[PDB]
Amino acid sequence: RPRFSFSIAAREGKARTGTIEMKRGVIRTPAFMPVGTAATVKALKPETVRATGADIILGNTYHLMLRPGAERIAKLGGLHSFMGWDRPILTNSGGYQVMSLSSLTKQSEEGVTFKSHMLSPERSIEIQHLLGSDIVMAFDECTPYPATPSRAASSMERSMRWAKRSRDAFDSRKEQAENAALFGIQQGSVFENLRQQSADALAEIGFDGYAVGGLAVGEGQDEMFRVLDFSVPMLPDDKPHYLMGVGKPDDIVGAVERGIDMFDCVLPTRSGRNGQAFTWDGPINIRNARFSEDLKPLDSECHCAVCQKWSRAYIHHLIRAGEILGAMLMTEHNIAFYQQLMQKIRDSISEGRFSQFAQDFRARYFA
Amino acid sequence: RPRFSFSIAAREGKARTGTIEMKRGVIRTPAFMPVGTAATVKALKPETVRATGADIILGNTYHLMLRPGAERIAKLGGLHSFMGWDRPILTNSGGYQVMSLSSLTKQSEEGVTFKSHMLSPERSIEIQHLLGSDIVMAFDECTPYPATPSRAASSMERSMRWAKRSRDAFDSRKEQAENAALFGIQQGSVFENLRQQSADALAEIGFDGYAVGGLAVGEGQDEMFRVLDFSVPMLPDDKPHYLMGVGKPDDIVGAVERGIDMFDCVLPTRSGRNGQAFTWDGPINIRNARFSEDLKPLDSECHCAVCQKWSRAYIHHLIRAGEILGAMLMTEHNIAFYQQLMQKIRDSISEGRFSQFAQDFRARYFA
Numbered sequence: 125r126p127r128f129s130f131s132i133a134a135r136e137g138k139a140r141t142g143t144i145e146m147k148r149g150v151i152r153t154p155a156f157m158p159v160g161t162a163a164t165v166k167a168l169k170p171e172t173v174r175a176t177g178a179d180i181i182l183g184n185t186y187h188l189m190l191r192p193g194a195e196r197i198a199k200l201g202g203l204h205s206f207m208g209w210d211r212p213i214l215t216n217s218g219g220y221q222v223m224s225l226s227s228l229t230k231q232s233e234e235g236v237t238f239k240s241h242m243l244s245p246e247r248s249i250e251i252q253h254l255l256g257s258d259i260v261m262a263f264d265e266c267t268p269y270p271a272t273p274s275r276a277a278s279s280m281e282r283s284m285r286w287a288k289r290s291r292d293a294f295d296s297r298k299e300q301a302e303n304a305a306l307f308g309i310q311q312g313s314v315f316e317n318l319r320q321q322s323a324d325a326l327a328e329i330g331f332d333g334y335a336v337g338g339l340a341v342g343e344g345q346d347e348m349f350r351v352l353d354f355s356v357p358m359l360p361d362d363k364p365h366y367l368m369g370v371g372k373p374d375d376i377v378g379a380v381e382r383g384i385d386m387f388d389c390v391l392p393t394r395s396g397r398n399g400q401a402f403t404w405d406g407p408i409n410i411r412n413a414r415f416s417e418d419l420k421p422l423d424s425e426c427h428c429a430v431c432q433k434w435s436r437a438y439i440h441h442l443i444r445a446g447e448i449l450g451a452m453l454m455t456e457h458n459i460a461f462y463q464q465l466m467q468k469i470r471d472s473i474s475e476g477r478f479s480q481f482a483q484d485f486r487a488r489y490f491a
Numbered sequence: 492r493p494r495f496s497f498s499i500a501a502r503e504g505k506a507r508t509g510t511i512e513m514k515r516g517v518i519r520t521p522a523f524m525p526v527g528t529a530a531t532v533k534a535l536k537p538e539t540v541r542a543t544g545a546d547i548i549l550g551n552t553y554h555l556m557l558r559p560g561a562e563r564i565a566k567l568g569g570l571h572s573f574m575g576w577d578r579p580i581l582t583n584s585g586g587y588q589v590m591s592l593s594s595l596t597k598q599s600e601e602g603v604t605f606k607s608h609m610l611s612p613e614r615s616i617e618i619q620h621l622l623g624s625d626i627v628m629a630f631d632e633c634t635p636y637p638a639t640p641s642r643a644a645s646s647m648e649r650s651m652r653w654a655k656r657s658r659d660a661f662d663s664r665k666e667q668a669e670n671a672a673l674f675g676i677q678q679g680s681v682f683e684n685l686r687q688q689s690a691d692a693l694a695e696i697g698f699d700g701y702a703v704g705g706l707a708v709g710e711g712q713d714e715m716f717r718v719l720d721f722s723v724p725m726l727p728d729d730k731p732h733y734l735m736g737v738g739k740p741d742d743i744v745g746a747v748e749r750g751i752d753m754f755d756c757v758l759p760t761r762s763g764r765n766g767q768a769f770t771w772d773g774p775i776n777i778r779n780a781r782f783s784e785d786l787k788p789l790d791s792e793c794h795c796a797v798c799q800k801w802s803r804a805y806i807h808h809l810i811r812a813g814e815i816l817g818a819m820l821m822t823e824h825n826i827a828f829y830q831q832l833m834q835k836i837r838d839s840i841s842e843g844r845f846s847q848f849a850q851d852f853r854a855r856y857f858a
């Protein structure tokens with residue numbers, strides 16, 4: 125098995141489908157990565173996550189470095205062994221989470237000091253190494269939205285300097301360089317010239333994959349798509365393109381249409397526990413009284429184990445009762461739905477009918 | 492498959508081991524019944540409950556009659572279909588829960604009026620019929636502890652009149668009488684003469700099984716065993732003996748030594764979510780800092796899936812983080828532990844070495 129090999133099997137417009145082969149397994153692209161909060165995909169055993177079709181999950185550097193700690197996880201055999209997921213894991217760099225979740229933050233050229241510590245590109249890489257991550261993210265800065273061009277520029281420039289430092293730290297660790305991959309993160313807010321400068325900088329350094337950062341920060345779908353329109357083509361075509369923190373099914377479809385290969389979002393897990401179930405006819409809230417005596421499964425096409433066995437009425441009852449099994453069943457279905465969406469996207473690109481799929485999907489989903 | 496056939500395969504002193512054959516499956520005795528709160532064994536899919544070795548679960552008449560309602564469950568196909576458990580289900584009568592959980596209660600010869608309705612023996616039987624219960628419990632009154640002999644007597648006497656009414660209501664419903672079994676409940680507090688009068692009354696009516704009610708209500712283990720000492724022999728030998736609401740592993744072993752065949756308790760599920768894990772060396776609280784880097788499974792003999800895959804350190808982390816998977820893994824292990832205990836009890840009685848097992852179990856469990 126190779127360390128990291130990306131192959132594009134088919135294209136339709138800007139959309140691509142293919143595979144990333146890594147030592148711990150193959151990732152089918154476009155891919156959706158279920159998010160692990162504290163070394164767990166919430167309410168799911170790893171075997172269940174795999175059963176939904178997931179090829180890779182995301183682990184959180186920020187949370188894990190605090191609890192149970194990176195050194196501790198390393199001492200216990202690494203994240204894979206710790207949580208019982210033996211397939212690839214992508215870890216975030218901590219760059220976004222440190223600014224989003226920390227009570228107080230001090231930013232400087234060295235990195236970020238915070239109250240739940242000091243995250244730097246070097247420390248981020250080290251933490252991800254200690255976790256045993258397969259895909260390591262460069263330490264970046266997610267520019268707040270909106271930003272002046274000047275603020276966006278100085279922020280993106282710092283991120284690019286941090287990207288080079290991340291590259292060097294990663295390359296310095298022989299075992300990491302041998303067995304893991306490193307992705308760079310494009311910044312530049314909504315500005316085409318800065319996105320270009322960022323892409324150029326990242327390409328000059330050279331990464332295994334490129335993330336489009338700085339989006340899904342309140343700009344809205346139209347604006348996000350507008351920025352993706354020009355940003356993705358700036359990235360190397362022959363490497364995977366990862367859109368961080370996205371998103372709703374419609375966001376995913378549109379992003380794929382614009383050349384994105386990888387996604388992660390808390391939406392299917394989070395909103396699942398909240399009562400939101402995804403269906404091909406759009407999301408439903410299972411708590412609604414309308415479902416109290418509905419014997420149909422959450423979605424009548426869905427192939428997941430939940431839809432094979434349990435009714436809307438039962439899941440309605442569980443969620444209204446605050447029962448853990450409610451969260452379990454909703455989460456498994458939603459993740460499975462996301463995986464089925466990705467499978468349909470992959471199949472349609474490979475068959476050269478993705479445009480029709482996107483149209484058909486939207487017509488029904490927003491009926 | 493028979494409606495209800497109890498066979499005793501082996502005995503050792505007062506202990507018995509055998510089987511109850513019912514239409515929906517075989518129950519190995521002595522049996523432990525995981526408790527379903529609101530049509531769910533908390534944090535477990537039914538397939539997982541079955542995987543732990545459970546042959547039968549307990550469903551709660553009191554909770555289900557309120558949410559989602561008995562008629563509603565019947566309309567949705569019955570409790571088995573609703574929750575996806577196709578094996579036997581025993582339902583409590585509501586007699587104890589109505590007094591324990593209701594904000595206000597009015598007691599009379601008709602039954603109990605309460606604020607979350609009016610439960611009577613007839614209504615209780617009807618509700619259990621609507622749920623589709625396999626083992627139906629007579630509607631009783633659990634006398635508070637302590638009670639004067641006179642209060643205990645009038646209470647037990649009412650329960651006996653209610654037992655006859657439960658019998659008649661059950662027998663009146665052809666489909667229930669054909670497919671389900673009915674258990675009577677002995678009362679009489681801690682008084683030998685009243686326990687005898689209660690047993691006589693129940694035997695004269697005639698039931699498929701007999702529960703020892705009115706225990707595990709704060710009397711303590713010594714007193715409970717003292718009462719079991721004389722109470723169980725009063726019950727028909729050729730029918731199953733069910734001790735309601737018991738209990739800790741040591742309570743179960745002692746009760747089996749005194750002729751009890753069936754148990755249910757919230758302990759393994761409840762305390763599991765709270766961080767308490769059962770082991771052969773006694774219970775542990777997985778939240779304790781001592782387990783933070785412990786790579787051993789919860790118990791090093793346990794055959795459950797949790798102990799095959801995950802460490803104490805990981806489960807420690809999950810429970811301290813408030814993660815649902817923590818509750819899932821703890822609950823599966825604890826239920827599996829209880830089932831392994833029951834299997835060891837069954838094997839040792841069948842092999843005529845139960846006395847030695849009980850001694851060996853206690854020496855190690857309370858080391």
Ligand SMILES: CNc1nc2cc3c(=O)[nH]c(N)nc3cc2[nH]1
Nearest residue numbers: 219220266337338339340368369
């Ligand atoms: C939910 N929306 C969202 N946008 C994001 C952007 C970044 C980003 O630019 N960098 C890093 N490191 N994580 C991110 C996570 C995001 N999550």
Ligand SMILES: CNc1nc2cc3c(=O)[nH]c(N)nc3cc2[nH]1
Nearest residue numbers: 586587633704705706707735736
């Ligand atoms: C946890 N201790 C406990 N003792 C019990 C006694 C009875 C009893 O006498 N009757 C009915 N119906 N349920 C019961 C449930 C119990 N639960």
Ligand SMILES: [Zn+2]
Nearest residue numbers: 426428431457
């Ligand atoms: Zn489904």
Ligand SMILES: [Zn+2]
Nearest residue numbers: 793795798824
């Ligand atoms: Zn176990």
